[PDB]
Amino acid sequence: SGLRKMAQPSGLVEPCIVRVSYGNNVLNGLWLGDEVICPRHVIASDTTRVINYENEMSSVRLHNFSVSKNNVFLGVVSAKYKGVNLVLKVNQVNPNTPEHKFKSIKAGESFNILACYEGCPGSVYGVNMRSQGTIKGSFIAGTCGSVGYVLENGILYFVYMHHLELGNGSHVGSNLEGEMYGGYEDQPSMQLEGTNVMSSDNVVAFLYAALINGERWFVTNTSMSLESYNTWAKTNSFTELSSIDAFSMLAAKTGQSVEKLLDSIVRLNKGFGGRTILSYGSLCDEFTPTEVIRQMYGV
Amino acid sequence: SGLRKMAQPSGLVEPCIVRVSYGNNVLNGLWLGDEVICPRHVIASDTTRVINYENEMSSVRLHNFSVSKNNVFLGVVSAKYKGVNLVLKVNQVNPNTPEHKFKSIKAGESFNILACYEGCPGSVYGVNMRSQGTIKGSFIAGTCGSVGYVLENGILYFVYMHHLELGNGSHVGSNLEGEMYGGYEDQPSMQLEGTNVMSSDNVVAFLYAALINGERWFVTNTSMSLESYNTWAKTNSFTELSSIDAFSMLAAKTGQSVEKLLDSIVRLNKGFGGRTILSYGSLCDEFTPTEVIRQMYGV
Ligand SMILES: *[C@H](O)[C@H](C[C@@H]1CCNC1=O)NC(=O)[C@H](CC(C)C)NC(=O)OCc1ccccc1
């Protein structure tokens, strides 16, 4: 059957993406109604040195912006900050505005990047939020403003707008409210990511995926308890397991129990000794339980 | 920077997928104009035993088809039988029909899967075609007639319809003209894939990606000439790198020559010494030169 990191379709989101430029700064904006949200660092004259955003807003001239979509130019009428984002009121309303809410993504939850280079939708991949509020995506010069979204029970949420990349390769963005995940600064300064807490829920779903695909070697007769585990987790940089009921269907279809895999995590966290689960030489927390159920049984 | 397997956006394609059933079989059709393409085995009374296709098609009533989108039912008037594909003429034309062409994918080449469960919305993800005309995607019961596509020069090409899974779990499909890739049969019989042959272009592309992400341990003070490598490849299940001029820019940007990388393949094909390259445990041929240049530079 196979296991692949998937994106939910880009259809509702593609038509919302605009080229936003100012001086030498070209990046991406989100166009809902008459509003256009994009990273504020697009104003700054020099983004390689510390920036004064009070100064930069004070000498902002609305005629200098070049907000565009396709062969439509959107004139700017108002520019305020909201957190690290810059909310522009533009002269047009997006005929293709979808029913949407804004939500903040939490450590362990999966979402979709529409990676856009300087105003063009480019590619869709699925990501997973790490404990320190970073993602391990693919982002370059020109992809700031690239938009993250989830679809839950018919509802479209926008959840992420791309800002920076940390010394260690990690990628940092903001919720559409304008708070940087992880509390990181919209500055070029050195910022350390700090130690990474693996999602116990997501590893369990991954191993359940392994089983459904035939890989069984990692499972013994040993079962660790929810209480035993959560204690072990607290000193081995691993989350406390939400609940056993999350995996009910998965436990049924395999005849293997969360407590059976919770022990697998412990034995494998010490090594694979050269073995691979679905071609990984190491445990993977990329996949939520929801993704595995969807991808293994179409639910 | 980072490297991910990506997909071109799906928003032209999403609205073309319908649900097609006949008897106990349910799968996906492509609705363009008044035409629904779909795999012919939708008509097989039992899809786990070898199928007499001329008998099963000889007793087929077109009224026994079900073809729906958003529980709006379309009515079948005619069909033509075209290779392993069925082409149903329906009473209604698809209002959301994108300007499209058709092409056939060659080994080495990348394309996008929209994976739909039983006409349902689905998930998007990039694949790459292996030497035997298979892919290693993610497919389950209910996902047949799921569609592959490339966007080249702003032109949408439909290129893949999904049919079956080999024992090894490789995935087989057809172009939209009903010719099945790698010549496989539309049957549950145990068909063997054949020897995988790795794309040399794609492995070089990949090592350039690693070079650009600061992973350098594989490069050495040794170059292998093109003819020299081509000899080695013929007897090691690798394609013949035809040119070097594809990699001109990656050569320039990185300072490393194709030949340095050609020699790295020969060494690394022996095995990684328990090291990794962008968290892979052996050479990767899933990324074309084009994909890497796009992803590292925005071109
Ligand atoms: C199409 O509905 C289905 C897609 C298969 C289901 C499992 N993964 C896929 O890609 N096609 C079939 O089931 C196909 C039927 C025709 C060839 C007549 N047979 C085949 O795909 O192998 C059956 C199989 C089912 C479950 C696991 C492994 C193989």
Numbering used by the authors:
A (entry chain B), B (entry chain A): 1 to 299
Article excerpt on this structure:
The genomes of coronaviruses usually encode a long polypeptide which must be cleaved by main protease (alternatively named 3-chymotrypsin-like protease, 3CLpro) for maturation of several critical components of viral replication machinery. The coronaviral Mpro utilizes a catalytic dyad of conserved cysteine and histidine to cleave the peptide bond at the C-terminal side of glutamine residue. Similar to other coronaviral Mpro, CCoV Mpro can be divided into three domains: domain I (residues 11–100), domain II (residues 101–198), and domain III (residues 199–299).
To further validate the inhibitory effect of GC376 on CCoV Mpro at the atomic level, we determined the complex structure of CCoV Mpro_GC376 to be a 2.75 Å resolution structure in the C2 space group. The asymmetric unit (A.U.) contains eight protomers of CCoV Mpro, which assemble into four functional dimers. Domains I and II adopt conserved chymotrypsin-like folds, in which the GC376 binds into the cleft between them. However, the GC376 bound to each protomer shows obvious structural variations, especially the P3 protecting group, suggesting that the malleability of the substrate-binding pocket of CCoV Mpro enables antiviral drug design. However, the hydroxyl group of (S)-hemithioacetal of GC376 forms weak H-bonds with the backbone amide of G142 and C144 (3.9 Å and 4.0 Å, respectively) of CCoV Mpro. We found that there was a large gap between domain III of the two protomers of CCoV Mpro (distance between the Cα atoms of G281 was 7.3 Å). Instead, the equivalent R4 residues in CCoV Mpro form hydrogen bond interactions with the main chain of G126.
